[model samples]
Target: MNIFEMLRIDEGLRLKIYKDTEGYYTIGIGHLLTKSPSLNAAKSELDKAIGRNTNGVITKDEAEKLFNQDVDAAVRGILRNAKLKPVYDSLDAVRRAALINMVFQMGEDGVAGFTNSLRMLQQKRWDEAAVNLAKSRWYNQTPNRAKRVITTFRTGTWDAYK
Candidate 1:
């Protein structure tokens, strides 16, 4: 099967940013492994599976270690990374899934680092959480991804979930 076929968009998947030229961009899945594994369309699904199920966090060195040392432990680390408090207080399964996927790509600290957003989410404040989520280094960097998720949370749409 085609790699894309294997990496079907599933729970928590989101489109990512791609720059074709300066000041010009697009959104897509399956980016080449060389550009950035964070959104690498082909490798991301595998990386994300390892990243999300383990802890949604792993440094480049850590991931490399996992690749060389123990793939299983690396996967588990990814899951544990994302299970931290406040960030783990997700009621909507889709939202939770999306958070995990994003956290997988961004790293657990990157996800938990959303101080304002995590605090709001912990309080079960959807709107506030959404707002805070939209205002971050990650958001600024991946506005389209942020916008999709922000829209997903607000509308209760599961599209962003996958």
Candidate 2:
């Protein structure tokens, strides 16, 4: 139940371009393209995914590369954030992985906004942290993923749920 595998399962890799729940063009494990365009280089990828040419799909190997890079970016986001890095540094590996997974789903800013939850996390109040997360629309948006991360937080065990 490593963070990579858990994210692959939760994000669901797709080689072809598909419209995400929010109707944005997305591909390769939730790599959203178009609609504000997070990736500057994604323009080429976007047109490829929109039913145009033979380049309409990315290879699995390419998608996997994207996944790894995305994970790396997410990790960097957590480590570079002023408030997040301290808590991230203080957590055990499993807890850290859970937090990284949350950051991947929602940006570092989104996770940082959980002031009370972060305080509870810093205090090692597992239940309170889980409760705070469960109360968010983010949890409702992806209940299964949220439950898995919450379970990880509460148990401090990597294999708590996957």
Candidate 3:
């Protein structure tokens, strides 16, 4: 599956706003409305994607549309980072999805903090990358998801998800 489909599975769909693990108000496929650029921008983007007012609840189509945008942002965020772009460009699609998944879950800046891990990934040192990743607090915070992402990084396959 593609990044969007994988994210849909990982994030789960929500039509109404709810508190996420960190207590931020999230909606639609893990869209953090609370952490969004701005309320007006978020609303405008939502309305534009849905082609109507959101009224605090969103349709599945809208959710899908919004999710695609978030994935695009995450993908762009990775490519735009100087250190990450080279590593990201050298990856295969499955491993690319793994990187995208980490960015999607942790945000670009959050993932960028992995100085040693990024270096390992950039060098195509999968085993070393996995080692650095596992030792991070991010791995401890969300063990299952982190494990899957780390496995994907090491194997460069979707078998981790399966």
Pick by TM-score: 1 or 3, better one: 3
User: For model 2, which pairs clash?
Assistant: none
Candidate 3 lDDT tens digits, 11-103? 899997666777666779988775554556556655665677876679888778788889999988988998778878988888899989888
Score residue 157 of candidate 3 by CA lDDT: 79
List the lowest-lDDT window of 10 residues for candidate 3.
34-43
Question: Where does the lowest 10-residue lDDT sum fall in candidate 2?
Answer: 47-56
lDDT per residue for candidate 2 within 1-162, as digits (tens), equals 687887887789888777776667778888767765344345476555444442447778777877887899999999899989988988998999899888987788999998888888989999988998799988888787789889999889866553
Which pairs in model 3 have colliding backbones?
Answer: none
Ranking by TM-score: 3, 2, 1
Off by over 4 Å in 2: 36-54, 160-162
Kindly report the root-mean-square deviation of model 3 from the true structure over all alpha carbons.
3.0
Candidate 2's TM-score: 0.85
Candidate 3: regions farther than 4 A off = 35-53
What's the true lDDT of residue 81 in model 2?
97
lDDT of 1 by residue, 31-148 (tens): 2123443434434444553455322233444444333333233234545764453455544655554555455445566666677776676577878778878877767876766676
TM-score of each: 0.50, 0.85, 0.86
Number of clashing residue pairs in every model? 16, 0, 0
lDDT of each: 0.48, 0.80, 0.82
